[PDB]
Amino acid sequence: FACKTANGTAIPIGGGSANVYVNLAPVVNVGQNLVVDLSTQIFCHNDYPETITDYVTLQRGSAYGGVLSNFSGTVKYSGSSYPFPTTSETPRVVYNSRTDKPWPVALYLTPVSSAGGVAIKAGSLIAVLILRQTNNYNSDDFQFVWNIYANNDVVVPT
Ligand SMILES: CCCCCCCO[C@H]1O[C@H](CO)[C@@H](O)[C@H](O)[C@@H]1O
Numbered sequence: 001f002a003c004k005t006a007n008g009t010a011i012p013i014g015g016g017s018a019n020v021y022v023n024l025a026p027v028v029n030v031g032q033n034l035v036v037d038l039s040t041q042i043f044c045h046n047d048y049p050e051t052i053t054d055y056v057t058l059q060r061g062s063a064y065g066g067v068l069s070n071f072s073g074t075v076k077y078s079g080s081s082y083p084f085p086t087t088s089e090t091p092r093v094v095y096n097s098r099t100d101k102p103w104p105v106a107l108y109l110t111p112v113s114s115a116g117g118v119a120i121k122a123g124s125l126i127a128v129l130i131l132r133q134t135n136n137y138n139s140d141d142f143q144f145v146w147n148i149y150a151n152n153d154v155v156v157p158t
Contacts, residue, residue, distance in 0.1 A: 001013065001044065001045070001046055001047060001054045001056075001095065001133050001135070001142070002044065002045065002047065003018075003042060003043065003044040003045075003103065003131065003144050004042075004043055004044075004100075005018060005020055005041055005042060005043075006040065006041050006042075006043075011144045013047065014142055015133070015142035015143045015144050015145075016144065016145070017144075017145035017146070017147065018144075018145075018146060018147070019146075019147045019148075019149060020038065020041050020042065020146050020147065020148050020149065021149050021150075021151050022036055022038075022041060022126075022148060022149070022150065022151060023151045023152060024036065024120060024150055024151065024152055024154050025154065026152060026153065026154060026155060027154075027155050027156075027157065028111060028119070028154055028155070028156055029111070029156065029157055030110075030111045030113065030115065030156065031110070031111075032110065032111075033108045033109065033110050034071065034107075034108075034109040034110070034111075034154060035106060035107070035108055035109075036106065036107040036109065036126075036127070036148070037106045037107075038103060038105040038106060038107070038129070038146070038148070039102040039103060039104050039105060039106060040102070042102065042103040042105070042131075042146060043100040043101065043102055043103065044056065044095055044100070044101060044103055044131075044133075044144075045095065045097065045098055045099060045100050045101065046095045046096055046097055046098060047098065048137075049096050049097050049098055051137065052135050052136065052137040053094060053095075053096055053135060053136045053137075054094070054095040054096070054133055054134070054135050055092040055093075055094060055095075055133065055134045055135060055136070056092060056093045056094075056095055056103070056131060056132070056133050057077075057089050057090045057091065057092050057093070057131070057132045058075065058077050058086065058089070058090040058105060058129060058130070058131065058132075059089050059090075059130040059131070059132035059143065060085075060086045060089065060129075060130050061075055061084050061085060061086045061105075061107075061127060061128070061129045061130070062085050062086075062127065062128045063084065063085045063126070063127055064124070064125045064126055064127060064128065065120065065121065065124040065125055065126055066118075066119050066120035066121060066124060066126065066150075066154070067109055067120060067126040067127060068085075069119075070111060070112060070114070070115040070119040070120070070156065071109040071110060071111055071112060071115070071119070072109070072110050072111075072112050073085065073107060073108070073109050073110075074107070074108040074109075075105065075106070075107055075108070076104075076105070076106045076107075076108065077090045077091075077093075077104060077105055078090075078091075078093050078104040079104070081108075084107055084108075084109075089132070092134075103131060105129060107127065111156045115156045116156050116157075116158040117155065117156065117158065118153050118154070118155055119154050119155065119156040120150050120153065120154035121150065121153060122150055122151065122152045122153045123149065123150065123151075124149065124150050125147060125148070125149055126148050126149065126150050127147075127148040128145065128146065128147055128148065129145075129146040129148065130143055130144070130145055130146075131143070131144040131145075131146065132144075
């Protein structure tokens with residue numbers, strides 16, 4: 001089991017960490033969602049689907065910088081919605097193919113009432129997402145840590 005980003009940055013068998021740089025909607029009004037769709041950014045696969053089933057969770061997700069200060073968060077994992085920053089490990093998604101499959105994570109971030117102006121700064125860390133991988137084969141229990149950075153400012157009109 002291993003993962004890679006849209007630009008080809010890989011985390012190999014056994015886990016590790018990688019940076020993900022995302023473009024963000026430049027203007028987000030109070031009442032609207034800023035959507036960070038990581039399912040277009042992070043892809044994983046099973047290296048031995050003939051014999052092994054891989055299990056994958058969002059073990060936890062943390063918010064940083066402007067997202068922590070200025071937004072109210074929800075994370076969607078494989079179609080189900082949870083608080084973000086997270087309060088529990090998600091159910092498992094099965095990886096049973098050698099063909100790359102998206103990691104089905106999306107953040108839905110809406111401005112808090114106090115938000116206004118540059119609510120997320122270009123280049124800032126906005127989230128850390130921990131992908132936890134196990135299997136039905138051995139005792140492997142690996143973390144793939146995704147550090148999410150903003151490519152641009154996000155402005156909340158006042
Ligand atoms: C003849 C024995 C072959 C043994 C292949 C084990 C390969 O293990 C890797 O790939 C497995 C399948 O993706 C993962 O479950 C495991 O954690 C690791 O990433």
